[PDB]
Amino acid sequence: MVAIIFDMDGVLYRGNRAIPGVRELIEFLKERGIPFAFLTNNSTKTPEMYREKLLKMGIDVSSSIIITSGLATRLYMSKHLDPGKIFVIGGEGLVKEMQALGWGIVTLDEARQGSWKEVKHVVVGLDPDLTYEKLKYATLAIRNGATFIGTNPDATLPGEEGIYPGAGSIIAALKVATNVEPIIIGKPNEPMYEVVREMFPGEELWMVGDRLDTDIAFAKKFGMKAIMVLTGVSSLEDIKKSEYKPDLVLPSVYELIDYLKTL
């Protein structure tokens, strides 16, 4: 009873470009009864927002099978930490997930008044509007004993003008400023796997991605079939100089159909 987990950007679509055959694949998985879920390290957007983006790319799926690092972070906090006030560095998606916890968020303004002193958890995701001030209060809070949580490790992600700094870039700065080892939630980390597992309890899991350092590393560390597609960031060549080795390489997710039909 196989369940397939798909990374999004570079797998189900590429930027603002649709990848041919994705709708067919998804229509096929439903026909075969094959459960699936989308898993993105990006924490700037909600599952709902992602459902809309997917629709625009010719894909219709429930936001219920869309797992973002932000939602994984909320689930991790709820299950393994003690409720306390949160200071957030990140976008709308992440703020919304933290608000949902209902633990209470210390705003930048309250922080300026000294409330960083009462922060129990610091959550860091990709923040396009990052400022030194934010790094300052996050550092003060983490140094005061606040949990240091990072949504994902990605050093970078594509931007309009080229390769832009990712959450890992921001998390790295705080690691240096606090001298504290962050708890990273997303791929290729265990908290993310815990979330996938919770959704699909006893299934044989397959991971389909385009990044070796996150997607493939994730599959190998947790025993998921490591399937890499070539529609994204990685190439056959990157495989060799990488510690992570795909169990299967396909041109795109469309080819998953005949792969599944021929066993």
Q: Is 169 in the site for a copy of itself (CB under 8 A)?
A: yes
Interface region with a copy of itself, contact rule CB under 8 A, candidates 2-10, 56-64, 139-147, 231-239: 139-147
Q: Is residue 258 part of an annotated ligand binding site?
A: no
Q: Is residue 9 part of an annotated ligand binding site?
A: yes
Looking up tokens 């599944």 gives 260
* Neighbouring C-alpha atoms within 13 Å toward the C-beta of 12: 27
From the list Mg ion, a copy of itself, none, pick the one residue 210 interacts with, judged by a Cβ distance below 5 to 8 Å according to partner type.
Mg ion
**How many angstroms separate the CA atoms of 58 and 62, rounded?**
13
CA 95 to chain centre: 15
Interface region with a copy of itself, contact rule CB under 8 A, candidates 7-15, 72-80, 125-133, 219-227: 125-133
| 245 in Cβ contact with 239 (< 8 Å) | yes
Looking up tokens 């991971």 gives 207
| 216 in Cβ contact with 245 (< 8 Å) | yes
Q: Is residue 7 part of an annotated ligand binding site?
A: yes
Q: Is 9 in the site for Mg ion (CB under 5 A)?
A: yes
Positions in 28-87 near a copy of itself (CB under 8 A): none
Q: Is 197 in the site for a copy of itself (CB under 8 A)?
A: no
Q: Name 17's Cβ contacts closer than 8 Å, sequence gap at least 6.
A: none
Q: Is 129 in the site for a copy of itself (CB under 8 A)?
A: yes
Residues in the chain that come right before a backbone break, where C and next N are over 2.5 Å apart: none
**How many angstroms separate the CA atoms of 227 and 39, rounded?**
14
Q: Is 213 in the site for Mg ion (CB under 5 A)?
A: no
**Interface with Mg ion by CB under 5 A: which residues?**
7, 9-10, 210
Binding-site residue numbers for Mg(2+) are 7, 9, 210
**Interface with a copy of itself by CB under 8 A: which residues?**
114, 116, 127-132, 135-136, 139-140, 143-144, 155-156, 159, 161-166, 168-170, 172-177, 179
Binding-site residue numbers are 7, 9, 210
